Amino acid sequence: LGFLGAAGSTMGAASMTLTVQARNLLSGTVWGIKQLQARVLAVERYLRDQQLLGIWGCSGKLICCTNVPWNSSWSNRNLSEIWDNMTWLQWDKEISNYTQIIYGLLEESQNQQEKNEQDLLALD
Amino acid sequence: LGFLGAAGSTMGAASMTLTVQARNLLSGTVWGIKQLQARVLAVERYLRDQQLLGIWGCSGKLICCTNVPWNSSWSNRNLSEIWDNMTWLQWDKEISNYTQIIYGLLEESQNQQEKNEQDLLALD
Amino acid sequence: LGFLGAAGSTMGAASMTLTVQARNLLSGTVWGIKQLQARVLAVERYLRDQQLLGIWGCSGKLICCTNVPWNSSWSNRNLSEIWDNMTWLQWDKEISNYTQIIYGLLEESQNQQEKNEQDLLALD
Amino acid sequence: ENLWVTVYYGVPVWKEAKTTLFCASDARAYEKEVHNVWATHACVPTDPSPQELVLGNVTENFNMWKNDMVDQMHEDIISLWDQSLKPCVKLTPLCVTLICSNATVKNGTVEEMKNCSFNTTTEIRDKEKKEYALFYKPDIVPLSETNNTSEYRLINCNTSACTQACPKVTFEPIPIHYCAPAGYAILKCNDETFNGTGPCSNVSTVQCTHGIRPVVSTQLLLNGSLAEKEIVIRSENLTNNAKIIIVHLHTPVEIVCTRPNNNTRKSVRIGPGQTFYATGDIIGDIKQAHCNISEEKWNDTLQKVGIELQKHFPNKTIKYNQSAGGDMEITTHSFNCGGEFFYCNTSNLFNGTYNGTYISTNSSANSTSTITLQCRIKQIINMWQGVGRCMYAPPIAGNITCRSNITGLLLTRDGGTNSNETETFRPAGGDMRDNWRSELYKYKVVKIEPLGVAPTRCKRRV
Amino acid sequence: CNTSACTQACPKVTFEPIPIHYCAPAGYAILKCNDETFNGTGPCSNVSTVQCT
Ligand SMILES: *[C@@H]1O[C@H](CO)[C@@H](O[C@@H]2O[C@H](CO)[C@@H](O[C@@H]3O[C@H](CO)[C@@H](O)[C@H](O[C@H]4O[C@H](CO)[C@@H](O)[C@H](O)[C@@H]4O)[C@@H]3O)[C@H](O)[C@H]2NC(C)=O)[C@H](O)[C@H]1NC(C)=O
Numbered sequence: 001l002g003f004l005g006a007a008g009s010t011m012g013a014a015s016m017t018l019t020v021q022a023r024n025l026l027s028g029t030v031w032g033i034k035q036l037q038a039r040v041l042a043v044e045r046y047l048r049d050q051q052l053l054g055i056w057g058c059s060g061k062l063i064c065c066t067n068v069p070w071n072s073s074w075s076n077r078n079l080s081e082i083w084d085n086m087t088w089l090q091w092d093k094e095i096s097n098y099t100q101i102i103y104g105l106l107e108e109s110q111n112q113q114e115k116n117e118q119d120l121l122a123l124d
Numbered sequence: 125l126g127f128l129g130a131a132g133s134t135m136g137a138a139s140m141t142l143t144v145q146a147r148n149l150l151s152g153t154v155w156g157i158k159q160l161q162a163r164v165l166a167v168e169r170y171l172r173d174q175q176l177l178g179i180w181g182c183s184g185k186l187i188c189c190t191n192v193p194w195n196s197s198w199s200n201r202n203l204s205e206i207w208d209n210m211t212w213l214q215w216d217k218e219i220s221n222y223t224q225i226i227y228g229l230l231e232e233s234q235n236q237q238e239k240n241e242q243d244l245l246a247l248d
Numbered sequence: 249l250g251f252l253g254a255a256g257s258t259m260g261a262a263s264m265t266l267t268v269q270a271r272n273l274l275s276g277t278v279w280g281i282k283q284l285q286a287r288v289l290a291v292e293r294y295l296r297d298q299q300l301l302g303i304w305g306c307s308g309k310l311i312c313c314t315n316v317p318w319n320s321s322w323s324n325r326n327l328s329e330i331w332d333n334m335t336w337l338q339w340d341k342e343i344s345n346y347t348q349i350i351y352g353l354l355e356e357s358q359n360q361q362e363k364n365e366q367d368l369l370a371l372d
Numbered sequence: 373e374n375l376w377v378t379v380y381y382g383v384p385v386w387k388e389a390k391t392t393l394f395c396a397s398d399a400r401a402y403e404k405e406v407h408n409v410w411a412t413h414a415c416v417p418t419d420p421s422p423q424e425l426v427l428g429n430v431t432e433n434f435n436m437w438k439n440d441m442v443d444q445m446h447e448d449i450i451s452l453w454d455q456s457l458k459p460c461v462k463l464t465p466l467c468v469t470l471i472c473s474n475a476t477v478k479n480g481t482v483e484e485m486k487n488c489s490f491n492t493t494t495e496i497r498d499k500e501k502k503e504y505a506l507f508y509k510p511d512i513v514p515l516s517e518t519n520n521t522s523e524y525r526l527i528n529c530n531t532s533a534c535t536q537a538c539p540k541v542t543f544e545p546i547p548i549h550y551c552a553p554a555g556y557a558i559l560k561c562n563d564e565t566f567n568g569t570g571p572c573s574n575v576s577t578v579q580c581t582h583g584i585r586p587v588v589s590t591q592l593l594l595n596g597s598l599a600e601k602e603i604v605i606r607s608e609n610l611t612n613n614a615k616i617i618i619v620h621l622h623t624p625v626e627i628v629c630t631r632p633n634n635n636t637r638k639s640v641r642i643g644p645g646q647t648f649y650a651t652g653d654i655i656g657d658i659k660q661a662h663c664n665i666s667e668e669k670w671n672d673t674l675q676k677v678g679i680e681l682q683k684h685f686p687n688k689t690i691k692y693n694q695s696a697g698g699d700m701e702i703t704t705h706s707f708n709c710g711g712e713f714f715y716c717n718t719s720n721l722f723n724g725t726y727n728g729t730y731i732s733t734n735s736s737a738n739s740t741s742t743i744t745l746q747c748r749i750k751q752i753i754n755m756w757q758g759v760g761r762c763m764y765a766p767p768i769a770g771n772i773t774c775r776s777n778i779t780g781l782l783l784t785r786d787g788g789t790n791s792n793e794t795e796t797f798r799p800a801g802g803d804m805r806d807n808w809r810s811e812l813y814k815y816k817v818v819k820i821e822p823l824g825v826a827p828t829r830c831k832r833r834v
Numbered sequence: 835c836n837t838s839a840c841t842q843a844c845p846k847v848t849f850e851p852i853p854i855h856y857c858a859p860a861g862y863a864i865l866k867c868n869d870e871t872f873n874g875t876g877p878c879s880n881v882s883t884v885q886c887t
């Protein structure tokens with residue numbers, strides 16, 4: 001399936017082969033400052049996602065359950081309609097509006113959960 | 125509290141909102157080579173902390189207990205005087221002298237602890 | 249032992265002090281675009297190993313057991329002959345041919361293993 | 373029985389590979405100004421740190437003629453010289469004719485120079501004035517196809533317009549330290565008997581190479597490093613006689629060169645906001661520039677080279693001859709004596725033969741006696757290609773002396789003769805890589821490959 | 835012509851003093867002495883932080 005063969009196929013199909021896309025953030029050697037600009041832009045853009053996914057406690061690579069529940073008003077759908085027939089490529093378009101509150105919740109939930117790993121370790 | 129609103133407040137207050145400061149190592153688009161230099165410097169400086177904190181086993185984001193004890197000669201204080209009234213900003217100045225031995229201990233302790241994860245898994 | 253003093257010594261000796269080599273990916277301040285090119289090249293090269301070792305589930309720093317068994321045809325050796333007398337520096341030369349299948353196995357095994365962390369957590 | 377694959381990172385493993393390398397220089401040079409010089413102006417300050425660390429046991433191979441580091445140094449030096457010649461005046465009005473007095477002497481045996489006269493622009497574009505300036509003879513070419521004695525021109529204005537070197541920036545050989553970037557390393561062949569190829573017995577690692585002096589000479593190697601043991605001969609090949617053969621001495625030979633003439637600078641204005649410098653007058657009497665070398669020391673040195681060179685020409689003689697003639701920029705030992713580009717006839721040095729037995733420094737008529745060489749001086753210097761070539765070296769007042777050490781030779785060999793032992797060696801040179809290759813024979817760059825694989829008795833916990 | 839050759843300023847480019855904002859890069863910060871009685875040295879009493887002057 002390579003770089004984007006999983007696109008269009010169902011979300012169940014695209015749930016696998018994520019590693020093929022994660023491995024594809026290298027390219028190029030340089031003439032002029034334009035290509036060097038491209039290299040630095042790519043590195044910064046990758047680290048943006050890397051250091052942002054990590055803040056949610058998802059250091060376990062690239063599929064990561066979180067404690068936050070799903071507010072059904074966002075989709076108003078059953079798990080079959082979300083997953084069995086739809087594709088990721090349009091699902092991103094459908095979910096595109098609500099992202100800020102979701103990211104804030106994922107930030108704060110792990111921000112407050114992290115201290116409890118100290119609290120349930122200091123008894124000894 | 126944003127970038128530095130927690131500064132000056134007590135270390136207990138500043139223990140929270142660490143995620144707000146970790147999320148603030150991204151900026152800029154370029155004219156000339158000076159701004160490009162700034163971008164590369166920022167990326168290298170961030171990765172230095174990222175890849176140095178990791179060697180101490182602290183891949184669990186940004187609060188991380190370890191096994192090395194407090195040599196009381198470093199501060200000569202009770203946990204209340206360190207924490208309940210003092211602020212991080214002056215605490216860094218007070219602790220600024222002793223850092224090399226602390227970093228060496230934090231390196232060697234995890235260097236020798238990591239093999240025991242093999243040793244207590246090779247029995248099977 | 250520093251940067252490369254462990255070279256030539258046995259693999260058992262070189263198994264320790266890995267942290268000394270991991271800490272040695274910083275250098276330089278710049279005249280001209282050549283040295284800036286060197287900096288960007290170094291950063292990209294480091295991240296290539298960092299984000300490739302991560303795909304194998306080895307976020308536990310830098311020694312990481314995997315579930316893939318060793319096909320004895322690759323070496324045809326006992327654990328004593330591999331480890332007690334040989335050195336890493338020649339072992340890399342000896343193993344240099346077979347790397348593609350090893351990396352593919354190490355990728356696919358963790359790609360299929362990660363979902364079971366959801367499956368053995370969805371019962372609740 | 374059961375063994376599972378484990379991945380190690382931070383491994384001590386490497387490959388020899390290509391990369392760009394930093395400058396580096398000691399801290400004392402940074403007291404000086406901008407553009408004076410590149411060792412400060414275009415190169416990073418660096419204490420030679422971290423210090424040298426010897427490796428306890430390494431299996432290693434080397435080759436110094438295929439090393440890319442010397443080619444990188446060549447590229448750096450040429451492209452940096454091109455940058456350094458940018459901010460200075462490019463002359464150009466001096467392509468006007470020179471009417472030069474037709475002096476004649478009864479073979480004075482001291483080069484007279486030619487005193488010339490020409491027109492130059494005053495402080496207005498439109499009004500002109502006559503000027504005069506003494507020029508060294510080799511840089512001045514007759515103009516007419518007929519037998520005219522009156523008119524002349526500069527040797528340039530047929531290839532390109534030369535650029536005056538600004539006197540604010542010097543030419544001294546400040547040492548350069550070459551440092552590899554992060555992720556790479558330099559492995560130093562610490563063996564004392566290494567001869568330029570094959571395996572080394574003893575290796576070390578150093579972050580920054582120490583003390584490379586960019587000093588340029590054609591035949592003799594000046595102010596270089598000294599070998600730890602016998603006077604090793606080095607060559608890429610000896611079936612291919614055309615391969616230049618590099619000799620690296622154990623002990624030095626002192627050489628002192630000087631220009632007794634007391635020249636005086638002149639200031640000639642050339643258009644708005646720039647000046648052309650030339651020799652205005654010679655104070656005192658006229659005399660001859662030269663180089664002096666200790667006599668018995670050179671004799672002993674050239675016999676000591678023979679006892680080592682003997683082995684690869686086993687049954688034959690070690691006999692020496694002058695260079696094979698040709699262009700004066702090729703045949704002569706050319707170097708800079710602190711501002712003046714000397715060109716020395718070396719024929720006094722290389723004349724003799726050896727018969728296999730070492731001989732003492734006695735008897736001696738007087739140990740203070742010295743062999744002397746005769747050298748000319750230029751100002752229009754054509755040395756490298758693609759750098760914008762010709763550069764006009766400005767004059768320097770007073771007198772000069774540049775006492776230095778000879779620490780190597782560059783030689784060339786003729787073909788076989790009559791199945792006879794008198795095949796002879798000649799000085800030669802001109803490919804600058806040979807100069808820098810004599811100092812980089814120790815080092816080699818590597819790339820660290822810190823990720824590796826091996827099995828052990830440890831499944832994953834999952 | 836006694837010093838150097840002067841260069842005409844092209845009339846297409848002006849000389850008006852358009853304001854400039856100085857912004858520190860990532861990892862850095864600017865602290866603004868918000869005190870109204872500051873006299874060019876010593877300690878400030880009230881401080882703020884701003885990304886761009
Ligand atoms: C190199 O050659 C140049 C010319 O090719 C020569 O420069 C000329 O030198 C003369 C002599 O100094 C200059 O003329 C002098 O100008 C002064 C001005 O105050 C006059 O007083 C002098 O008059 C006396 O000398 C004349 C003979 O030179 C007599 O004819 C006269 O009656 C007086 O006795 C004299 O005119 C002249 O200006 C320069 N020319 C230029 C272009 O500079 C220089 O001297 C030569 N140098 C060497 C080392 O050979």
Ligand SMILES: *[C@@H]1O[C@H](CO)[C@@H](O[C@@H]2O[C@H](CO)[C@@H](O[C@@H]3O[C@H](CO)[C@@H](O)[C@H](O)[C@@H]3O)[C@H](O)[C@H]2NC(C)=O)[C@H](O)[C@H]1NC(C)=O
Pocket residue numbers: 630771772773
């Ligand atoms: C200009 O010419 C004068 C005289 O012709 C030069 O003077 C000579 O300079 C050398 C420099 O090495 C002097 O060397 C001496 O060396 C001994 C050690 O052998 C030392 O003890 C002395 O203190 C001295 O430095 C030499 O004595 C001196 N005089 C003579 C007659 O040779 C001068 O060097 C020339 N200037 C330039 C810039 O070249």
